[PDB]
Symmetry: D2
Subunit: 288 residues, 4 copies
């Protein structure tokens, strides 16, 4: 009985409501998130693009850019990792299936696929386009059918709220769940009551994307729990703070000609070592 990341993801859900899931930009941060107490983590598509590739979250990244990051993270962190699979990385059901089987094999616990057209955009940006309900239904069926691990999770995300309104988004969501989606990700919700309506209408775990500087208020876990939200996602929160701190170090070092004045903003060498279990490894080298 080999370990199933997906099974571990489903177990975390039953032990935390809502289950907080934080984006981890790289393997180091996955370890930091685990040490902080989280029971599940996330690989943001916008993060693979903007962080790993330094590019816009506009469907430019490829499946392999993401797989590389999944392997790096799951090779060292035992937490179940939910992965952003954008639209499935291809225009046919064959692409969706390969995507699903590859991510399962890379170590992921689950993934979400959205109903946007090819060159997708952040769910919190204007002018997004979505495929037909039928089009998305086929994507979902292909994904579910491709599962090699029954516990791997196939989550459906809908970007329809801002484009077709709430009733339309709910109808799509119900059809997606009927097609096999196991959990639902209604993107960029503006009101708490909406989460409740979605939850009541599809009766499968609901995810709330609590990202900064977008269309969604910074709801607390208490508020989300009252709306029956199953999980709270913070996709790029740590990444945003990491970039500001790094930018600060770069600027000060450039203007001052030394980093002395910003040493107090740095994780210490010992802290890094403790994060990666450094001493236990070096000791083994010394014993040779």
């Amino acid at each position: 009985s080999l370990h199933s990341p997906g099974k571990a993801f489903r177990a975390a859900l039953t032990k935390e409501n809502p289950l907080q899931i934080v984006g981890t930009i790289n393997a180091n941060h996955a370890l930091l998130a685990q040490r902080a107490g989280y029971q599940a983590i996330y690989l943001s598509g916008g993060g693979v693009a903007a962080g790993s590739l330094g590019l816009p979250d506009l469907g430019i990244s490829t499946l392999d850019d993401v797989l590389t990051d999944i392997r790096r993270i799951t090779d060292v962190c035992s937490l179940p990792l939910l992965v952003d699979a954008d639209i499935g990385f291809g225009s046919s059901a064959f692409n969706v299936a390969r995507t699903v089987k590859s991510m399962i094999k890379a170590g992921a616990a689950g993934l979400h696929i959205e109903d946007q057209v090819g060159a997708k955009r952040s769910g919190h940006r204007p002018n997004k386009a979505i495929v037909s309900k039928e089009e998305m239904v086929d994507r979902i069926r292909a994904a579910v059918d491709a599962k090699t691990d029954p516990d791997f999770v196939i989550m459906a995300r809908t970007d329809a709220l801002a484009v077709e309104g709430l009733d339309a988004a709910i109808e799509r969501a119900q059809a997606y769940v009927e097609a096999g989606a196991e959990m639902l990700f209604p993107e960029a919700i503006t009101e708490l009551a909406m989460y409740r309506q979605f939850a009541d209408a599809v009766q499968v775990p609901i995810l709330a994307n609590i990202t900064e500087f977008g269309a969604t208020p910074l709801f607390t876990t208490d508020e989300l729990r009252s709306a029956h939200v199953a999980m709270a996602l913070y996709p790029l929160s740590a990444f945003r703070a990491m970039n500001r701190a790094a930018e600060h170090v770069y600027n000060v070092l450039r203007q001052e000609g030394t980093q002395k004045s910003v040493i107090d903003t740095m994780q210490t060498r010992n802290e890094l070592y403790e994060s990666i279990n450094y001493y236990q490894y070096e000791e083994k080298l010394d014993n040779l």
Copy 2:
């Protein structure tokens, strides 16, 4: 065709000492460029601890490093100096493949060191180094493998803490005589030593101004007085990014919301300007 190595050598000519900052990923390479830096660095200790979440003990593979080189150089035009540890393999063939691959991936140069296979931070105790002759063979293999004459083969010696100053300088002399184009005397404890290395080899020397190690936090002015050609800050940004990320994780877990740390976050517009997001969205919308 453009030569990153040529751009690196040109940067040395415009700035002395040339500040080179480690960039943990592509995003950070763009931030460094925007900050004014003329050259950047891909830390081996960072590929290990950041990209892999593992100790800087010769566990990473050539490909883990190649992946980060392509990601950074695909989007950032600055010449990238790359940490190639000992060449990734036990033979001269591994060293040669490492050089050719890194050149093709987009790097401007690399540094290879004289430690044994399972190397450790130059700022950690009990390191073990190979003989002067063994290192010379690694250097000769690296130099002869160059497919771009302007690519830089920098030799790093970890011998100061192991055999002493005189021995380390003797090794540096042999390394440069063998073709090493620049020298990286690791974990120097006194400012005066940099001057001695520089005088002894007559090639650009790099000072590794990393935090929490054996080397004082020398300023560019002080390094200039010691004839240092490059001042390297390998993981500085990374260390601050880690503390910031950790703080966000802790606050969110304790408070159930990130409201109280919003003021520590890079804004959406700042991120967008950093990755030229508007240039792309405009094209899509038109």
Copy 3:
């Protein structure tokens, strides 16, 4: 610095038509170079069927191809023309990223086509080819993405098979006008048609002389009489390698030994000579 694209263009002026053979992996690229070829090809059908064991229906990723490009060009100096299908993505950004990545991987040039998704690969006759304007957009994105000016951007279209000769020629002229540097018209069955395309666009024309298809096995002399600039043999060696490998598997399974098929095998020394084995091992012996 060396430019594979420049070498490819040089080969074209020296050999006409230029024979370009598909090489399924690095080893075969070396065999092709030793056989005298001046340019080689990375077949999209071969990456799918050979490297992935999958049908040529748009399932392969850019990365799958890039891996093969690096393996081949890291060891073989011949200019490599690469099949880039439709750019590996939904937009001009994907097309641009594909061009830059392949150049960095070591390729000499690539061909991009006009199908919608993999609809043409799937033999759909209707709404399977993008509009002339959409393909022009793909071509412009690719040409503008070139980091090496000598890298080659070739346009491929099999519109003849669905829209007729006239429409195909009209698309080709628009593609070349948009910046396509060479043309790969697919599904041609008559020599005279190659001449018609050559006259219509006035840029090098590629003839796909693959086996078991609609196109006859035209000879280089015949292709020259039709003004064809290059002759492509995409999977020729691959097909022979598969039959030979299948034969070894069957005999070994039926007989319990490979004694009876030893005579069908490349010997150890022939392999060693192909990969310059001895020059390497000697260096290890004299450390």
Copy 4:
């Protein structure tokens, strides 16, 4: 959840000896499966000479191999035994990461040998091996890193040509005592030797029946009589494939057409069947 390693062990109990054929790429792995084989192999010499066009002298990296493992196992369900040379690095940490990475890539098992870093083919002269103690440490690290208990850690010894038979058997016993699950005595020259190894370690032994080497082309019956559990044909198909490819290149270059060699080619219909083409298209 499926375990390739468990499948490999099962194949052994169902086929005696188990014929294991090297598959140079995913396509050939499907050909092997369609031909009736129950286990396949990823040759290190093949990854080097075929996928990279380089000598089998420790130049390939762990990732070069991992890429071929994923390509083969993503499409072919047969258990794949993988050549891991010496663990891909100078330390036990490298050996461990190699084991864990190969399991995740989809392999059923791997073999690690007792040669020095820049290793060479077991059928080449002048090989150098590490001490018995050094190999034992590589084996312990490898066994301890197993994330799937059914994944197989096979130890290979190249000591026969260097230290002789008794020394090779002594090393083999130490390797198995260290946790090696199966044994690969390389470049054996006499059938009887296999029996001596089998009697000495009592774990399944693999015979490397590669061509043009130090080992006679023993039949599966001869191998069974010597108590050999597995018969390996590492590059057999690869060798025939290269000669056939070379022929096509030469003829095409000399004749200006491939007409005269069409009969040596797998047909399009045959290729499509081998990769289940029509199975896809109608979906």
